[PDB]
Write an enzyme that holds these catalytic residues in place. Structure first.
Site, short mmCIF file in Angstrom:
data_model
loop_
_atom_site.label_atom_id
_atom_site.label_comp_id
_atom_site.label_asym_id
_atom_site.label_seq_id
_atom_site.Cartn_x
_atom_site.Cartn_y
_atom_site.Cartn_z
N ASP A 527 0.85 -1.18 0.00
CA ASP A 527 0.00 0.00 0.00
C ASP A 527 0.89 1.23 0.00
O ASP A 527 2.00 1.21 0.53
CB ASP A 527 -0.94 0.01 1.22
N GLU A 565 10.97 10.62 -7.45
CA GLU A 565 9.76 9.83 -7.64
C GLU A 565 10.07 8.33 -7.67
O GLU A 565 9.25 7.52 -7.22
CB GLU A 565 9.05 10.28 -8.92
N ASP A 597 -2.22 -0.60 -4.04
CA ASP A 597 -3.30 0.31 -3.73
C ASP A 597 -3.04 1.69 -4.33
O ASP A 597 -1.90 2.07 -4.60
CB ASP A 597 -3.48 0.46 -2.21
N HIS A 730 -2.33 -0.15 5.59
CA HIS A 730 -2.98 1.14 5.80
C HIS A 730 -2.78 1.64 7.22
O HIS A 730 -2.39 2.80 7.43
CB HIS A 730 -4.48 1.01 5.49
#
Ligand code: MG
EC number: 3.1.26.-
Length: 755
Positions: A527, A565, A597, A730
């Site tokens: 995630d 990035e 995700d 998460h």
RNA sequence: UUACCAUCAACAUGGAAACUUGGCUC
RNA sequence: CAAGUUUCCAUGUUGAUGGUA
């Protein structure tokens, strides 16, 4: 785009309720023109009006969205047209040059098939706010809330493997009739001498909506010394005053000119924007309204709609589309025959799996609720805690006596080696000494414990400092409790016993298993928790299955580097996960299932080519280890609704269904699994898109594997929105990115602290 | 930061279409 | 190639209350 068969065989079929369009493709070419209005008018109103003033040249069949016009009949290369403004008599020079010849089977037709539908439902006296269309003829006005709710529709035309469709969500919008100007008047009436501080307190952080172009604008400052009687320089390089700007673009003559101005400063890149209070309205939900029991129970008794109320609103939209002739010509000149009734999706309820306990093994029923199956027997995968420090300030003694004096009672049916907490008081909650107490003691309790930081009121700095000290400087958990939540004995059974086991879960206590028919399966829920509103280092949550029966999981956070990035972390995260797997199971997997995700639909190509190829090339660290991988993308904020079509009415079911045709994406392989345990409202289904599927997985196999992964999170009696590692990652990513701003301690890694 | 589940609101990011501006080379 | 504008969209996160609890 290959023709891929998606439907399965095993399962009980169902009936759903939202497709709404089937069109035949007829037009051989559509001609697109980009139009430069010289001089510049910015509002859509004149850009519709003066284009409608010249249907002798353009024609009655028009589709214009502010700058792009669409025709079915080709003109010459460049046509030049003169128009005169209804207010200041300007020399508006419309120039139409043909730029694109749209093919009947091209995906570029979706913008103008969508703006023709917006031009269709702009004729039904439906307003535009934000993105969507809202109906002012079926509103509810709440005087004591100072509020008005509109039962509009968020409707969008998109292409699908089952052809063209239009997905419509019954979106109720709250609009405050109070503007920022009238609430400024109300605060000034409430406080004549001391209103500027209240404006700077309830205006910054608040976000307005301006309706001359329906834009939603974030307030950064408010200034009183500058009025629109002063002018500025707009985009053409010529000076204009703001009142003549109004009269030349939006035409909305203002009522007063002594009002202040609002300053909006965008993100770094730069153009500061100035907004009048009169044309700017609030966000219409007051949190000062909210602090009572009568807010949602008197407002959202209709806003939390039933599925049948969704279907009734959508059939009312279809009825007012069909019974309006002027909307019908605006569909049928372009030959887009909307279906006069709803179009329905078939369903699939999977053969529902088995939950294996320590001794029992249930077949999962249709309700998915085993709430009071807790406090039955001692769990094997538990470190039996004994002592933990409990802190409370000098205002809430009996409040602490609400919690802990009941908690030893749920040591009753278990009968583990429990002992009362270290009741250590606090002299002062004013920032300090609460830091000092916990690592001053750290004593006999600190083996397997529970830190309970209880704070009166909502204070961000206090809990931030407590969690930063109590999760950075020492290996120690923490838990913030606000006394406002536990302030009444009514909220005790639902707050103390069934939940607030965060600390008992943070030391790693869990067991139940779901049967998996495959061999050597490694499932890993990557995630990405982004925080770019704060504008700092995004956080990757890494969780992987480090065993065979999926009972233990990995945890990793690594902070990224700004202005970089390319991920420097995920190789190290996979290295740590594989090292834990080789430490626990002493082996290497055969297949890898990744549940990525948080990407947009246009971003999967990047995940198809810029990240997952780097995952395949990441495996150079181990010799001859390049096995098959499976990549999935999870999605939450979805606009597709699901209703079972019982022969009397429509009811959204319990989680478990599979929808895989005529709702998906046109290029990739998608499916939809409903995951809302519906007690009220319409259940949004989770959207799972695959990227790489070289393991030859049949659709029912990966759907049932996704539901099996949904079945294994130790927090609930009922199923979850996203599967278990994507909630583990998460929780750990949100905790380790927003609160302590640090990696979790290595000395806690044997526990499952992501619960 | 207490189990998930709606809804409301807000922020930020990304894809496509062209337009305009700027940049070493014809 | 980069940046901005306008259209279509798509995606997460946060805060808040109502529900089983
Ligand atoms: Mg997430």
């Amino acid at each position: 785009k290959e023709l891929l068969v998606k439907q399965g065989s095993k399962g009980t079929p169902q009936s759903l309720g939202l497709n709404l369009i089937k069109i035949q493709c007829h037009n051989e070419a559509v001609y697109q023109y980009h139009v430069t209005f010289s001089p510049s008018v910015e509002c859509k109103s004149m850009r519709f009006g003066m284009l409608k003033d010249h249907q002798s040249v353009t024609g009655n069949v028009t589709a214009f969205d502010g700058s792009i016009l669409y025709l079915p009949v080709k003109l010459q290369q460049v046509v030049e047209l003169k128009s005169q403004r209804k207010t200041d008599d300007a020399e508006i020079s419309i120039k139409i040059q043909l730029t694109k010849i749209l093919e009947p089977c091209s995906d570029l037709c979706i913008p103008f098939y969508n703006v023709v539908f917006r031009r269709v439902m702009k004729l039904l006296d439906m307003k535009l706010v934000g993105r969507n269309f809202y109906d002012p003829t079926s509103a509810m006005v709440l005087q004591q809330h100072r509020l008005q709710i509109w039962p509009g529709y968020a409707a969008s035309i998109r292409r699908t493997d089952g052809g063209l469709f239009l997905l419509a969500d019954v979106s109720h919008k709250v609009i405050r009739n109070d503007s920022v100007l009238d609430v400024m008047h109300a605060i000034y009436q409430q406080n004549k001498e001391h209103f500027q501080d209240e404006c700077s307190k309830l205006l910054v952080g608040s976000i307005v909506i301006t309706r001359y172009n329906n834009r939603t604008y974030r307030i950064d400052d408010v200034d009183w010394n500058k009025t629109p009687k002063d002018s500025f320089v707009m985009s053409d390089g010529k000076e204009i005053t703001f009142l003549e700007y109004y009269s030349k673009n939006y035409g909305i003559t203002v009522k007063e000119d002594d009002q202040p101005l609002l300053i909006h400063r965008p993100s770094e890149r730069k153009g500061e924007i100035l907004l009048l209070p009169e044309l700017s309205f609030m966000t219409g939900i007051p949190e000062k309204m909210k602090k009572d029991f009568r807010a949602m129970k008197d407002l959202t008794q209709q806003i939390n709609l039933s599925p049948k109320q969704h279907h009734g609103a959508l059939e009312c939209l279809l009825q007012r589309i069909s019974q309006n002739e002027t909307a019908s010509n605006e569909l049928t000149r372009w030959g887009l025959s909307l279906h006069k009734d709803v179009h329905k999706i078939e369903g699939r309820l999977l053969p529902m799996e088995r939950i294996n306990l320590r001794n029992t093994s249930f077949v999962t029923s249709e309700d998915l609720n085993w709430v009071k199956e807790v406090t039955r027997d001692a769990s094997i995968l538990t470190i039996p805690m004994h002592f933990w420090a409990l802190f409370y300030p000098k205002r809430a003694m009996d409040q602490a006596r609400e919690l802990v004096n009941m908690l030893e009672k749920i040591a009753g049916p278990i009968g583990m080696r429990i002992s009362p907490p270290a009741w250590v008081e606090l002299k002062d909650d004013r920032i300090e000494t609460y830091i000092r107490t916990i690592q001053s003691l750290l004593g006999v309790e600190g083996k397997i414990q529970m830190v309970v930081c209880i704070i009166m009121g909502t204070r961000d700095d206090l809990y931030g400092a407590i969690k930063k000290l109590c999760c950075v400087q020492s290996p120690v958990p923490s838990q913030v409790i606000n006394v406002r939540t536990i302030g009444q004995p009514t909220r005790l059974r639902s707050v103390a016993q069934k939940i607030l086991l965060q600390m008992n879960c943070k030391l790693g206590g869990e067991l139940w298993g779901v049967d998996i028919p495959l061999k050597q399966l490694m499932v890993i829920g990557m995630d990405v928790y982004h925080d770019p509103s704060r504008g700092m280092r995004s956080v990757v949550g890494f969780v992987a299955s480090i065993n065979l029966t999926l009972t233990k999981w990995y945890s990793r956070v690594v902070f990224q580097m700004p202005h970089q990035e390319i991920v420097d972390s995920l190789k190290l995260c996979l290295v740590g996960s594989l090292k834990k797997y080789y430490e626990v199971n002493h082996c290497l997997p055969e297949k890898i299932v990744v549940y990525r995700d948080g990407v947009s639909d246009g971003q999967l190509k990047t995940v198809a080519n810029y990240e997952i190829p780097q995952l395949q090339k990441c495996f150079e660290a181990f010799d001859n280890y390049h096995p098959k991988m499976v990549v999935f993308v999870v999605q939450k904020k979805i606009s597709t609704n699901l209703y079972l079509a019982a022969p009397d009415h429509f009811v959204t079911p319990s989680p478990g269904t599979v929808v895989d045709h005529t709702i998906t994406s046109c290029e990739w392989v998608d499916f939809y699994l409903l995951a809302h345990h519906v007690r009220q409202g319409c259940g949004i289904p989770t959207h799972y898109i695959c990227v790489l599927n070289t393991a030859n997985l049949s659709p029912d196999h990966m759907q049932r594997l996704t539901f099996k992964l949904c079945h294994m999170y130790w927090n609930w009696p009922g199923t979850i929105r996203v599967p278990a590692p994507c909630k583990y990652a998460h929780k750990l990513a949100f905790l380790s990115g927003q609160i302590l701003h640090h990696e979790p301690a290595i000395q806690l890694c044997g526990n499952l602290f992501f619960l």
